[model samples]
Target: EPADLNDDTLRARAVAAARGDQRFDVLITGGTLVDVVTGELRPADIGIVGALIASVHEPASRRDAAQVIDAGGAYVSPGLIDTHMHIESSMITPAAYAAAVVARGVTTIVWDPHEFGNVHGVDGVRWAAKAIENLPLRAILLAPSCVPSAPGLERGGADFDAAILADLLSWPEIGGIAEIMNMRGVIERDPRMSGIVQAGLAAEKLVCGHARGLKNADLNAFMAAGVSSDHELVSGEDLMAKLRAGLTIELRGSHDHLLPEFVAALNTLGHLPQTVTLCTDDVFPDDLLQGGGLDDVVRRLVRYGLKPEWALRAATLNAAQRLGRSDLGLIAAGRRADIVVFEDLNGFSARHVLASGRAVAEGGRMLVDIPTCDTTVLKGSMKLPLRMANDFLVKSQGAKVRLATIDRPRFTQWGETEADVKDGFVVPPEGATMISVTHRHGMAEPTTKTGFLTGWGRWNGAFATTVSHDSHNLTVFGGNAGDMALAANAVIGTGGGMAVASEGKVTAILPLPLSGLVSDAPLEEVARAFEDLREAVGKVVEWQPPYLVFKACFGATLACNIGPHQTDMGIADVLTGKVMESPVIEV
Candidate 1:
């Protein structure tokens, strides 16, 4: 039996069958089950009734089941969950984003739509909720508690007030208040922050924290304000302090390259498995599609001398415990039948994935039967109402050159170094010389500034992107002024996209018209666009050792430039307090 072939009554019958446990709907045979709860590897036959596990026993015991999956020579573990992530970082819609990562074995993602909400407001949050209605993977929404990241520090887009937080908290789909980014306000008991935190507390929801550099008293004050967890602990010492303070620490792969140190600290403290979990705070589209998702974090942990079982526990059980979701992250008699079958422990190549008991992916591919959505909200969202020619110009009086220049940082590292050229303009060793930032919300005028860049080698023209991180605004760097203009114009012409201009002509473009941040295109399409952009960049500028455009956008470059006497310039230094500017540029 196909477990009630009638499509209309399938959900109701499935729920009923799961509750009763009368018949096993499917059985997985000949797999080594990693019992996260018991910390044992046992050969077992798993039986599933509807969307819940019924039993774990020998294969012959469930021979009469309706469906059977041969799991011979495979390891069965609970489906992987990403404790913290931002969906827009993939530069795609929620559905497309889910489709892309699900094929890689990510079953559940706790996504923060703050990036989009900053640009599009509440409609952006609602759009994410609506986009995942029939997704194969679980997209848990975490209401963005901080907009503009910090107040009076930066400006743009919308602001989050208590009323707005309360309204969003009422939504059933909202998982919790996303990392309360305004740590100072929270600790100082600022009335606005207090009201928002209290509302989330009253709703009995998690209040995620984002305390980056707090120590001792400040850290204690933040925890006292009812923040349950933090994803910003970048060092072993910082992590240990938060753990001591009773704050759940999500060790993120993107921010902290300190995984090995943190793991050692965990072992040293003997609290490795109890209070810590894994997360990919931010992953680019290319990394998500090519490398892996949270699975990458797991493999990295194993490589750093962590036992395989411990890595599994950190990824699954510990993560679930942190989220307070007891129904998931384990394979038990009554737990949800969310599981992953992989060939090897270290590689984590998901051969098959089941969410709520239905096979969503098989053999590293998603079996998506759902139709692609034509989300009107995403269309033209990136397009500016104004014309392109009037924007993206470098203007100065009397050619004295009061031009703007950004302090370029080392890749995959934080901090920045400011460079001064002859009157803000330097003939590159060869390539181009222009810096640009496009209006993300399509509200402000786009600006282009000419300056000197030492490291990028031999650029033919320009490199432009709407994928500038944290803010997701448009940015372009180039040698030729005309190419810079052309690149900026090309992006504006497409509504919103990444464009490369060479020899005074537009050479490449990747349209991301949706809110001017993400492309509505397929994963492969977006990857190809990124590739094209990279190839074009190679033609214009030559990067020195340890510098990549991808790393530059993720605050990695800034990390590498954190030495003393480094002059601050542009948005990078402005946000990190290495520079002083309200908008980075004033139109």
Candidate 2:
């Protein structure tokens, strides 16, 4: 026996190059191989050499394989690939996030990393690329198409246009252009955003989209503009239109209320097409741990009457083809050996999952260890200076006031409300709350812009986060002036984090010094701590924690806002990207 067989050359040389005699690194027998590409299943033995498939042969054909797995009574399929997601939304580092999902049969993920861009600008995406380099999960990074998202509407850490595009888009890891969230900018032909899309087309890369709440002609026009995919479809009508327009539909499992509708529509449609895929665009750490990952989405699809084969294809082959990756998405010779062995296509519970022909997960647990990331470079992200606790005071001299708020449960759209005046100012309208954006970019003096919001904040305490969306500014929401002040101070006191304060005392916090958008701890700790934060918040606010994260984003990100939005400088007109009035004005 060779003393050391770990060498790559020895690894490949063991597997049969063509037929019988050559040994293989791993062989599987007694399973029906699900061929996603040709739409057929054949009971066979698979020969894996190193990270690639060496051969697929008739059942029980290969006897000389070095190691073997009994795949009896299971479907051996390609490992699930999430076409699009934001790793930061889970509040975990890429390394930790990989540990949570790798065992769930997700071998690969394609990410936009725009949330990183929102806070750290170009460096945020770069940090992610370097951090995830050695992880077991494969990734396709889309160069962030928007930084501030809506440039004039929200001020971010940095700006991106044609000049900045070349360096990032050229990286071998960047697969395509991220979602073009600014359809209004595109429709109006805004120079900066238009140029961003043009650069992507010029580079011949896939141009993704975020056409939320769009329908009929508006949807068609956006697709005609070369935006290739949409994950924000809320209704079946929108789904049908995008599919007809040849745009990939990323069905988000995180949209709790919409899943029933999605399933019902699919049941009526009676056929699952290749144009549709399932994704967890933004999954809170709790939901991910409790429910499942891509495997859960596949199960739901099957329950909703999607032909099991088509459903599997959407998660695997179709996702691979979408990314222009012929190397993944199939269990065949020459393809990377990313495979999932599962019982009955319904539950999608993987007994054993392999990445690069190595068993990284078996029995719902990670077998391989994820390397600890060096986070020394990501410190000092908070830019709060010349700030005070008294800044959160909502003082105004007014009689009648126009206020903006998010509707109940539907945090994506805006609803208008008004309140009666008492002292110089008025409180939030019924069923709504108060909010303000505190700029901490260090590019200017500390600033605060106040606005009313719905489905966010609470009555007795305050919520604060440096994890503010798109800009990653220090944002706080509360009714009590003292509580708001305390909460805001608590957040920056820790450098950056999500904080909750009640009656002038800090109740809980989770530090996120890395751009104020993600946690530096192990994923389990992050998830557990975040759950603690969510629980603390639940005591005061009638809300889910992730939606609070969603509410923090209304100020910027430019993906969703019905009317004016609050930013550090002031209220911004959603469409024009201009300040509607002074940061504070007497009505």
Top candidate when judged by TM-score against the true structure: 2
lDDT by residue (tens digit), candidate 1, 1-587 = 12332244545544444444455687788899988877788888887876767677764555646888878899888888888888777777777777666766677888888877876778888888877777877777888887655443333356778889989999988878998877777888988888889888888888888888888899888888888888888688887888888887777887536888877987796545476777788776777778777888887888776777777877788888877777678877657778988788888888888888888888887786654666677666554443243233433323232223332444212222332233333323232244445444644543332333434455677766655544455566666556777886677667666787888778778787776677777877887787777677666656564554434633321211222111112333422445332121322
Local accuracy of candidate 2 as per-residue lDDT tens digits, 1-587: 01232456744564545366687778877898888866687788888877777888888777766678778998899999887788888877888788888888999888889878876778888888998888889877888887776566667677788668767878878877888777877766778777877787888888889888777777777776778898988777767766777888887776665766776676677766677777878877777776676777787777766667877888988887787777778887767789989877888888888998898888788999887677765677677763455565455567666655544433445566666665665654576665677777676557776666666555678778777666767777776667777777776766778888887787888888777777777767877888888788766676566555534433332323556566776666665556643433336
Local lDDT at 54 for model 1: 67
lDDT of each: 0.67, 0.74
CA shift at 135, candidate 2, in angstroms? 1.5
Error of 1 at 574 (Å): 7.2
TM-score of each: 0.82, 0.89
Cα lDDT for residue 500, model 2?
Answer: 81
TM-score of model number 2: 0.89
Q: Poorest 10 consecutive residues of model 1 by lDDT? A: 559-568
